[PDB]
Design a protein around this ligand. Structure first.
Ligand SMILES: [Zn+2]
Ligand SMILES: [Zn+2]
Lengths: 76, 199, 50, 99, 209, 50, 107, 149
């Protein structure tokens, strides 16, 4: 809860990549895509809709960690 | 003779650039090989690969150099204030005096979302607010503008016109820009520094 | 017949715009000749490449 | 007011209109504005016409007269300095020799 | 001579007083703000002034920690201090029961005397200072920031706030001029306040190692 | 040309091309034109999904 | 100075005999006693420069006068032109304007 | 006669040339000393010189005389001045990070192979940068395990 509440661009890129890799492997879609043959477009639509089932696990350098949901974080 | 001298100067420039390219390539290689280990952590402390801390905070404050709007400054308060006044002109709200501006600034700054912000940026905001309030006071003293809002020439209120809505918009925009202009954790700051020094 | 002017913004940095009819009527037509060499040599034994 | 130039549309430094758009309304609006500019400026530049000729670099009569006068004055002053240094004492500037 | 030598002596005395005030020893305001006229009143000539004895100081005590703790300062008259002078100073400190001593050399220290002073005794701490370095105060320099030695509680709070260890803090050599000026040992931490371009300040920390 | 600098830090890869550039203002800043010939050579592995 | 023996031509050194200082050679018994004073001056070069510099009149040894700068538009200026880069197709400018103690320095 | 005129009678032996620079500010024209020497302590120790406002270009002398933080500040100022001399500007955070990396072990360590070996610990990077065989054989002798951090 001490880190920045904004979702950085690196986290955005990694979440989008993981979601695209999952959707490419026959993962269920939660945004009811309309003629999107590109998995990255579906991942971006899910990110804009805030429906990505991925929780970022931010690790502190000492060893502590904290979980943040995509819908909980702030996107730009 | 003049053509020969011009060709001499051109060849001097060419060989100078030829040596400069190689020298800067070697320097850039060394700088990147030395600085590629640093990275910005989540606790706002730049640490090396072995875990040793190089800086407790990047640049002393923690702002992104790529998102630096001013000359080594996060925001240009004058331009932001002008943009806020231009984008959101409220014609149905009266102008603010010096005391009212200071009061509303102190009332808005003491909210919860402004607590997590750095103290230096808040002090700069207070200084800019005091300066613009002094400017408004000087204008109203030069043109005899009364703070009660009953002056017959209303065009006098158009010299330095400010409304609490514009004040809130300016403060929120400055806070959002200062929050989004901070160093994002995980960025390879060392490589960026090496490249921005070598280029 | 070159005309020094800006046209369609396809000659921004050192580029040039060519005329289709000029290239169609033989302007700039070039020929590239390449060589392909092969050798049929006889070895130590009484045999040859055929 | 004002006319666009490198100080406002170029990649020189801050205060660029595209930079203001990027910092105020996001990346997409700035990209769209740059695309519209890159699609508009060539069309108008071709429809108006912009050319350079030998007559755009030729000097005028007054310019030639001024150049001749300046060359004469400079050569006279250089000859005076040469004569002062070679024969006599020349005022030596601080931090350097007479030559 | 007799004009620049007394000025150097007065400036060295003022620098030593400032160093003792920064380290926490007991010094009155008169000793800190000592004009050249008062030094001339004490001694205005070089032969009248006594480097080995008239310049020594014994009233330096750590009033903040313990008044019983005493620190001594020596001003050897010879340019190069030998083994015999170091032994005489050590036996004088033994007689007077003093553990902390400074030695303001005039030109330098011989390598044998340096090696002996290094391993004199763990209880007898002696620090060598060249007068050429003491002619200017390092703290008053514009490039040198403000350094404050933090106590064990502050070090513990720093390690707890960032969840760090001792070896993870930035290092600073014991032979650093500021380190010898403050007389910090291995394991102590110093907070440094760098003046930024704006009205704010940058707080950093360094461990002596 | 050693192993570290020639084969570890920097190494050659496939699925890449090299071609001369030419200006085209009718495209966006985030878009780049690719020839048809190179596009038929550089392939992308897409996984069959629903 | 450098003296040589008339006999063999080798260099003469100065030593002390039984009566007075004398020049002598190391390869022959030739000697020469010193009668009167002998001197050899060298007249080393003295420091003639006062090492005073930086005058405003001497500093303003430049062409730039009564121009317009995009910083403070003061007349007195100081321009410098550089052409030592082939990668940069245009040239390079450096303008300074310290008429009202501004001290600008840009590209 | 070969070395009698070449003996020093007054001044610092390390100092080779000192000139009187003047600033012609509209308020007042002030005088300063520009010394082409490699001894800052001696210059600060001389009478009449305000040592509190004395700087230098050699980072090693500043480090040895006024501490590691003064050396870091000198490095930052010198890099910024050298960059401004060419008309190009760099954000101060980059040079601050560079100086902090060069001055985080208490000693100014260069970007050369010596400073890079003294700062870093990874064997693979030291081998890849310079002195491959020497570093590899030294690591094989020491048996130092290298992590993947
Ligand atoms: Zn002879
Ligand atoms: Zn001007």
């Amino acid at each position: 809860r001490i880190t920045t509440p904004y979702m950085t661009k690196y986290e955005r890129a990694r979440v989008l990549g993981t979601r695209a890799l999952q959707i490419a492997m026959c993962a269920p879609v939660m945004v009811e895509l309309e003629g999107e043959t590109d998995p990255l477009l579906i991942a971006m639509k899910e990110l804009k809709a805030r429906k990505i089932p991925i929780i970022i696990r931010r690790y502190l350098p000492d060893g502590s960690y904290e979980d943040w949901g995509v819908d909980e974080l702030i996107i730009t | 003779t003049e053509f020969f001298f011009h060709t001499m100067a051109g060849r001097e420039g060419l060989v100078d650039t030829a040596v400069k390219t190689a020298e800067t390539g070697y320097m850039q290689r060394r700088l990147v090989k030395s600085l590629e280990d640093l990275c910005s952590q989540y606790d706002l402390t730049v640490r090396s690969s072995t875990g040793d801390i190089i800086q407790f905070i990047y640049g002393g404050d923690g702002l992104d150099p790529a998102a630096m709007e001013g000359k080594d400054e996060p925001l240009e308060f004058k331009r932001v204030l002008d943009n806020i006044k231009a984008v959101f002109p409220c014609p149905s709200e009266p102008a603010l005096s010096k005391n009212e501006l200071i009061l509303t600034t102190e009332s808005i700054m003491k909210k919860s979302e402004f607590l997590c912000c750095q103290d230096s940026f808040l002090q700069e905001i207070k200084k800019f607010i005091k300066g613009v309030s002094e400017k408004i006071k000087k204008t109203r003293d030069k043109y005899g503008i009364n703070d009660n809002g009953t002056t017959e020439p209303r065009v006098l209120y158009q010299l330095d016109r400010i409304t609490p809505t514009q004040v809130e918009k300016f403060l929120e925009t400055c806070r959002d820009k200062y929050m989004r202009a901070q160093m994002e954790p995980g960025s390879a700051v060392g490589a960026l520094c090496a490249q921005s020094i070598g280029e | 017949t070159v005309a020094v002017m800006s046209y369609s913004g396809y000659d921004i940095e050192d580029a040039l715009v060519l005329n289709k009819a000029s290239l169609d009527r033989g302007f700039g037509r070039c020929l590239v000749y390449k060589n392909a060499k092969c050798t049929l040599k006889r070895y130590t034994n009484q045999t040859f490449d055929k | 007011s004002g006319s666009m130039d490198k100080g406002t549309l170029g990649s020189g430094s801050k205060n660029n209109i595209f930079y203001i758009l990027l910092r105020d309304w996001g990346q997409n609006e700035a990209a769209d504005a740059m695309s519209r500019l890159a699609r508009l400026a060539p069309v108008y530049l071709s429809n108006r016409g912009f050319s350079i000729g030998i007559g755009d670099v030729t000097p005028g009569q007054g310019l030639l007269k001024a150049k001749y006068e300046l060359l004469n004055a400079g050569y006279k002053k250089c000859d005076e300095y040469i004569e002062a240094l070679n024969t006599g004492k020349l005022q030596q500037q601080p931090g350097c020799t007479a030559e | 001579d007799d004009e620049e030598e007394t000025y150097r002596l007065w400036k060295i005395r003022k620098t030593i007083m400032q160093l003792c005030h920064d380290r926490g020893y007991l010094v009155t305001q008169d000793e800190l703000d000592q004009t050249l006229e008062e030094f001339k009143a004490q001694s205005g000539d070089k032969p009248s002034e006594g480097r080995p004895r008239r310049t020594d100081l014994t009233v330096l005590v750590a009033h903040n920690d313990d008044p019983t703790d005493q620190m001594f300062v020596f001003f050897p008259e010879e340019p190069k201090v030998g083994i015999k002078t170091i032994k005489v100073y050590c036996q004088r400190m033994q007689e007077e029961n003093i553990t902390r001593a400074l030695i303001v050399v005039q030109q330098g220290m011989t390598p044998s005397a340096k090696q002996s002073l290094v391993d004199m005794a763990p209880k007898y701490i002696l620090e060598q200072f060249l007068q050429q370095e003491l002619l200017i105060n390092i703290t008053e320099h514009e490039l040198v920031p403000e350094h404050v030695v933090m106590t064990k509680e502050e070090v513990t709070e720093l390690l707890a706030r960032y969840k760090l260890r001792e070896n993870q803090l930035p290092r600073i050599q014991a032979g650093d001029p500021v380190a010898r000026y403050f007389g910090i040992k291995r394991g102590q931490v110093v907070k440094i306040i760098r003046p930024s371009e704006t009205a704010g300040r940058y707080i950093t920390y360094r461990l002596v190692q | 040309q050693g192993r570290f600098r020639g084969n570890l830090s920097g190494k050659r890869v496939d699925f890449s091309g090299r071609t001369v550039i030419s200006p085209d203002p009718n495209l966006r800043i985030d878009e780049v034109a690719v020839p048809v010939h190179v596009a038929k050579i550089l392939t992308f592995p897409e996984k069959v999904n629903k | 100075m450098l003296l040589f023996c008339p006999g063999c031509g080798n260099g003469l050194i100065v030593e002390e005999g039984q009566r007075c200082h004398r020049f002598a050679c190391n390869t022959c018994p030739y000697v020469h006693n010193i009668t009167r004073k002998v001197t050899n001056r060298k007249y080393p070069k003295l420091k003639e420069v006062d090492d005073v510099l930086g005058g405003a009149a001497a500093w303003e040894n430049v062409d730039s006068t009564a121009e317009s700068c995009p910083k403070c538009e003061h007349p007195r200026a100081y321009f410098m032109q550089l052409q030592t880069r082939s990668a940069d197709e245009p040239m390079t400018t450096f303008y300074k304007c310290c008429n009202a103690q501004c001290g600008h320095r840009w590209r | 006669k070969e070395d009698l005129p070449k003996v020093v009678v007054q001044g610092i032996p390390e100092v080779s040339r000192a000139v009187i620079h003047i600033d012609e500010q509209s308020g007042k024209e002030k005088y300063k000393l520009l010394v082409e020497g490699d001894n800052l302590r001696a210059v600060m120790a001389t009478h009449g010189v305000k040592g509190t406002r004395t700087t230098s270009n050699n980072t090693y002398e500043v480090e040895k005389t006024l501490g590691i933080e003064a050396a870091r500040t000198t490095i930052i100022n010198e890099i910024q001045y050298t960059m401004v001399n060419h008309g190009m500007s760099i954000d101060r955070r980059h040079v601050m990070l560079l100086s902090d990396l060069m001055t985080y072990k208490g000693e100014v360590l260069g970007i050369t192979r010596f400073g890079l070996a003294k700062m870093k610990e990874s064997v693979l990077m030291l081998a890849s940068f310079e002195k491959t065989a020497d570093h590899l054989f030294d690591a094989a002798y020491f048996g130092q395990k290298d992590s993947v951090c």
